[PDB]
Write a protein that binds this DNA or RNA. Structure first.
Ligand SMILES: Nc1nc2c(ncn2[C@H]2C[C@H](O)[C@@H](COP(=O)(O)NP(=O)(O)OP(=O)(O)O)O2)c(=O)[nH]1
Ligand SMILES: [Mg+2]
Ligand SMILES: [Mg+2]
Length: 429
DNA sequence: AGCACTGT
DNA sequence: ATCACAGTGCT
């Protein structure tokens, strides 16, 4: 804990998740360059998930499918289901629940996104350590594990699986010889458990995933990306100095945006490791007490954000953009789409209440007007008393109708480029 | 409470 | 003209 080695934390991330879901359903897509796309009409659809075969051609997320086909002519495409005029992600939310439920059998999980979850293995590691007590850890228990930073020094060596094994052997040889620390043993056992977790996910869903194992959430997530796909990486406390010495600051979670850019600009540094030069007080003065404290500890491999026990989303939301000439202008238009959104929301809320024994109590309504730089022009709350689509849509209209700045009966102005309904403030029931 | 930021 | 979500922190 003084060196931030009290916990064993893992981050599991499903490999090209939406693709895997579609590839499981359509075997003709397996082991092929493939992507998942929503809305075929505009340039073949926007790509939101890309198999690794397709990545090898340069296909990326946030790319029009027509442009993707220019890079990858044999690219196959699965379409997001469309329901009530909009993209419907239910299939991937259900697939995500399959996975989370398996992970819960092993430990406390924090659902971080639709396709990844943090795991706190600290207690499971102790449990496992007293079983087989004193018995050595065989390389056969870690068949897909990389040890970041290894192999090193002097004493297969040209291909990747050979590299992995050498690094693992070096790690395990130093373990059983007492040349490593107690937290290093714990991470190793954590990694044995994460192998079993990943094998169970694949056996029971067909989905492959990658994992990071380390002492905190940031290092776990960083480690998870070092060896994708279908592999897991152990980032020990001792590997942090070399790992961070050339790690771009933007690669650390929460520094990929404006804050990270201002750390680079204000301090004149490029890599996470350079942050160790500064005093905590110096970092607090530039970035605030909380950010400074977090940065001072994080650049040394230390962070204390806990794995929250939260397997379910906190909100259930429903949105649609209306770009360009499709922006909503008549009142009958806003009311029709508000109803479409409200109807999908009701279905999902009803399923939620039956599955998870809880009810939302607040309806958040957000819109965007044509010509606003910000992603949201107005957010407004109202009570959510019944799971009734028509009420929610009327209430959503009631709380935005004052945005219309026009006189004509059947006209809305300025036109709306975005509607968003969100149920929140869940309570047991 | 409304908003900005950050992430998948 | 990507888009559809979702969580956290500030004031
Ligand atoms: N609509 C939309 N969906 C997204 C976006 N980013 C991700 N998703 C959806 C699609 C993704 O399938 C899922 C998980 O996102 P990741 O873990 O960041 N990428 P993946 O799991 O696909 O591949 P790997 O993890 O091996 O890099 O969330 C986005 O910008 N937009
Ligand atoms: Mg993923
Ligand atoms: Mg992910």
């Amino acid at each position: 804990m003084a060196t931030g080695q009290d916990r064993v934390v893992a981050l599991v991330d499903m490999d090209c998740f939406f693709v895997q879901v579609e590839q499981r359903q359509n075997p003709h897509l397996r082991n092929k360059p493939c992507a998942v796309v929503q809305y075929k009409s505009w340039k073949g659809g926007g790509i939101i998930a890309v198999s690794y075969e397709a990545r090898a051609f340069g296909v990326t997320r946030s790319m029009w499918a027509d442009d993707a086909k220019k890079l990858c002519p044999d690219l196959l495409l699965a379409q997001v289901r469309e329901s009530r005029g909009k993209a419907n992600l239910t299939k991937y939310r259900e697939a995500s629940v399959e996975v989370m439920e398996i992970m819960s059998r092993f430990a406390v999980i924090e659902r971080a996104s639709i396709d990844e979850a943090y795991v706190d293995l600290t207690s499971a590691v102790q449990e496992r350590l007293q079983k087989l007590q004193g018995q050595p850890i065989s390389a056969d228990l870690l068949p897909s594990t990389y040890i970041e930073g290894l192999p090193q020094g002097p004493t297969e060596t040209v291909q990747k699986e050979g590299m992995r094994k050498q690094g693992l052997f070096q790690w395990l040889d130093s373990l059983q010889i007492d040349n490593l620390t107690s937290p290093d043993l714990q991470l190793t056992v954590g990694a044995v458990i994460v192998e079993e977790m990943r094998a169970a996910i694949e056996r029971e869903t067909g989905f492959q995933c990658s994992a990071g194992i380390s002492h905190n959430k940031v290092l776990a997530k960083l480690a998870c990306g070092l060896n994708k796909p279908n592999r897991q990486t152990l980032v020990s406390h001792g590997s942090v100095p070399q790992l961070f010495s050339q790690m771009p600051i933007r690669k650390i979670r929460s520094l990929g945006g404006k804050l990270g850019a201002s750390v680079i600009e204000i301090l004149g540094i490029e890599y996470m490791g350079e942050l160790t030069q500064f005093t905590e007080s110096q970092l607090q003065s530039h970035f605030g007490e909380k950010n400074g404290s977090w940065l001072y500890a994080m650049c040394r491999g230390i962070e204390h954000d806990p794995v929250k026990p939260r397997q379910l989303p906190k909100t259930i939301g429903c949105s649609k953009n209306f770009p360009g000439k499709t922006a909503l202008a008549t009142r009958e238009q806003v009311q029709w789409w508000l109803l479409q959104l409200a109807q999908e929301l009701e279905e999902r809320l009803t399923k939620d209440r039956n599955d998870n024994d809880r009810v939302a109590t607040q309806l958040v309504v957000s819109i965007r007007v044509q010509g606003d730089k910000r992603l949201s022009s107005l957010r407004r709350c109202c009570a959510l008393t019944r799971y009734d689509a028509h009420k929610m849509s009327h209430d959503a209209f009631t709380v935005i109708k004052n945005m219309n700045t026009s006189g004509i009966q059947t006209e809305w102005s300025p036109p709306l480029t975005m509607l968003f309904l969100c149920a929140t403030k869940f309570s047991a029931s």
